[PDB]
Amino acid sequence: IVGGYTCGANTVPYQVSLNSGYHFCGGSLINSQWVVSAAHCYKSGIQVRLGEDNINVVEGNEQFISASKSIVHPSYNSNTLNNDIMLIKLKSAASLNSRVASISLPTSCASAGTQCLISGWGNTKSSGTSYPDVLKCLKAPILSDSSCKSAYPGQITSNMFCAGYLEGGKDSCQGDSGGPVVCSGKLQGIVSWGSGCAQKNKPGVYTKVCNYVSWIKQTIASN
Ligand SMILES: NC(=[NH2+])c1ccc2nc(-c3ccccc3O)[nH]c2c1
Numbered sequence: 186i187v188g189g190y191t192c193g194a195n196t197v198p199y200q201v202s203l204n205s206g207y208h209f210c211g212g213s214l215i216n217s218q219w220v221v222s223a224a225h226c227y228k229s230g231i232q233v234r235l236g237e238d239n240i241n242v243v244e245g246n247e248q249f250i251s252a253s254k255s256i257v258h259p260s261y262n263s264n265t266l267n268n269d270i271m272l273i274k275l276k277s278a279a280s281l282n283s284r285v286a287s288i289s290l291p292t293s294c295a296s297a298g299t300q301c302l303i304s305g306w307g308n309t310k311s312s313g314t315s316y317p318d319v320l321k322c323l324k325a326p327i328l329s330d331s332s333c334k335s336a337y338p339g340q341i342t343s344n345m346f347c348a349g350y351l352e353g354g355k356d357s358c359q360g361d362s363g364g365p366v367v368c369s370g371k372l373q374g375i376v377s378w379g380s381g382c383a384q385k386n387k388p389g390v391y392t393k394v395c396n397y398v399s400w401i402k403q404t405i406a407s408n
């Protein structure tokens with residue numbers, strides 16, 4: 186996250202870290218045995234880490250659980266990142282309390298102007314790299330579809346939305362992919378892509394979760 190603030194330990198209780206020997210993507214806990222992330226974060230041998238604040242120090246609230254299966258969206262296109270969403274089922278259910286809790290899926294799609302909370306352990310610099318060990322947060326608004334398509338002509342589909350600042354300085358970044366965009370207590374987006382990070386007129390682009398609720402619910406119900 187570039188230009189964000191330190192969230193504070195376990196203040197984002199649905200945030201997970203996907204680990205394959207190291208943190209490589211974020212994710213959101215949607216129930217005690219399922220995590221939603223970005224399809225471009227897919228790989229085999231994923232261990233889901235819940236209750237994390239400092240990903241390099243075991244502080245006491247962590248739950249490390251392996252994935253039993255991953256399901257990438259049937260229409261995911263890795264060249265355009267359209268339908269960039271995946272589901273991960275945990276080998277055992279996590280123990281939910283105040284520091285590890287699931288986030289609700291939305292009943293309605295959020296509108297431009299909505300302020301949301303984006304979080305992750307991604308790079309905090311726009312030029313250069315500095316990866317933080319504790320969770321960073323950013324409050325940002327969803328932008329109009331007009332501003333979004335104008336910033337990325339020919340690349341935005343109906344399954345994506347932009348959120349951020351056209352002025353730059355604040356954005357999600359590499360290492361934040363797969364994480365949550367929560368607006369009014371509902372998971373409305375998944376950190377998906379951007380052109381660099383925090384650059385002027387290049388806001389972050391997110392998977393529009395409201396368009397996948399039926400698929401998520403039907404998938405969980407049968408697996
Ligand atoms: N600017 C942004 N909002 C952004 C967000 C997530 C990203 N994730 C990446 C990324 C880059 C290389 C490999 C995987 C990634 O998720 N770039 C990203 C950029």
Ligand SMILES: [Ca+2]
Pocket residue numbers: 237238239240241242243244245247
């Ligand atoms: Ca830790």
